[PDB]
C-alpha cells in the first residue's frame, strides 16, 4: 500500500543458494571419486556379472563427468545471475545518491525493469531444474536395476557371506554419515572452504581391484574430529568385510564397492535437484515484489518520501551485497573443489 510494505530484499535466495552449494559441492567430490576409481578389467571368471559391473561403472563415470563439467558450470551461471541482480539493486541505490528531482520516476522504472530481470532468472533456474530432474529420472532406474542384480546374487549366498554383505552395506551407510559430518564442518553454512581428498581404503583380490574412498584433508584441523576417527575405524572394518566376502564371490564385492560410490553420487544428485526445485518460485517471488514496489516507489516524490525510499533501497542494497559475497564464496568453492587431492 505504501513504502513500508514493499520487499526489495533477496528473500530466501541467500539460504537457498547455500543449501544448493551444500549438496552440489559434495556431489562434485563424489563425481571426482567415480572418475578416480580404478576401472574393473575383463578379469572374466564370470563374464556376465563383469559386463554388468563395467556397464554401470562406465555409465556412472559418464554422468559424473557431465555433472563435474556441465551441471556445475550451469549452476555457476545461475549464481552469476544472482551477482548480476545484486549489482542492479546497487545501481538503483547509486541513482538515489544523486539529487535528481525526478528520481522517483527513474527509480520506479528501474525497479519495474529489475522485476523483468528476476522473471528471466526464474526461467533460467527452471531450465537447470528441468535438466537435473530429467537426469534424476534416468539415474534412479539405472541404480535400481543394478541393485536388483546385486540382490539376486545375495539371495544365493551362504550364512557367513550374507553377513559380510550386511556388514558392507552398514559400513557404507556409516561412512556416508562420517563424510557428511566432515564436509558440513568445513562448509560452516556457506562461510567456509569445503575441501575433501581421497585414498585407496580397501582392495578385492581377483589381480587387485582397488577401491577409492573420500578422506578429510588435515586429519588435525577439520572441525568434526569425531567423524574422522570413526571414518578411519569404518574404512579398516570395511576393508576386512570386502576381503572376506571376496573369498565367496569376488565380483560381488567389486559390484557392492561400485554401488556404494553410486549411492553417494545419486543420493546427493537427488538432494541437489530438491534444493533447486524451490529456486524458480523464489526468483518469481522477487519478480512479483519488484513489480508491486514500482508504483509505490513512484508515488514517493516529496523531499521526505524520497529520503525514506533512499533509506529502504540502501538497506536492501546492503542485503544484496552480503548475498553477492556469499555467491563469490560459493563460486570460489566450486572452482577450488574441482580437484579431489590424494592423502596418505
Numbering used by the authors: 2 to 207, 229 to 366
In the authors' words:
Tripartite α-PFTs are members of the ClyA α-PFT family. Proteins in this family undergo a large scale conformational change from a compact soluble structure, where the hydrophobic residues are hidden often within a β-tongue motif, to an extended pore structure with the hydrophobic residues exposed in two extended α-helices which insert into the cell membrane. Here we show that S. marcescens has a tripartite haemolytic α-PFT (SmhABC), and propose a mechanism of pore assembly. We present the structures of the soluble A component (SmhA), as well as the soluble and pore conformations of the B component (SmhB).
SmhA folds into two distinct domains, a compact five helical bundle (α1, α2, α3, α6 and α7), and an associated head domain containing two helices (α4 and α5), and the β-tongue domain (two long anti-parallel β-strands, β1 and β2). In all monomers, there is missing density for approximately 20 residues between β1 and β2 (G208 – A229). Residues E192-V205 (β1 and loop to α3) and Y231-N250 (β2 and loop to α4) of the β-tongue domain are largely hydrophobic containing only polar uncharged and nonpolar residues, and are buried in the core of the protein, packing against α1, α3, α4, α5 (residues A272-Q283), and residues N351-E367 at the C-terminus. However, in SmhA, NheA and Hbl-B, this region has an additional extended loop and short helix that extends the length of the tail domain, a feature not observed in SmhB or AhlB. AhlB and SmhB use both a short β-strand and a short helix connected by a loop, while SmhA uses only a short loop perpendicular to β1. The second region is between the N-terminus and β-tongue, which includes a family conserved glutamine (Q38 SmhA, Q32 SmhB, Q45 NheA) on the N-terminal helix α1 that forms hydrogen bonds with the β-sheet backbone of the β-tongue. In SmhA Q38 and in NheA Q45 also interact with Q263 and Q282, respectively on α6, a residue conserved in all A component proteins. In addition, both SmhA and SmhB contain a family conserved (conserved in all but 1 sequence) lysine residue at the C-terminus (K333 in both SmhA and SmhB) that forms a hydrogen bond with a conserved hydroxyl (T81 SmhA; T78 SmhB) on helix α2. As soluble SmhA, SmhB and AhlB all share very similar structures, we propose that the head domain of SmhA would also unfold into its pore form about 2 hinges in the same way as seen in SmhB and AhlB, with hinge 1 between α3 and α4, and α5 and α6, and hinge 2 between α4 and β1, and α5 and β2. This would result in the pore form of SmhA having a similar extended helical structure to that of AhlB and SmhB.
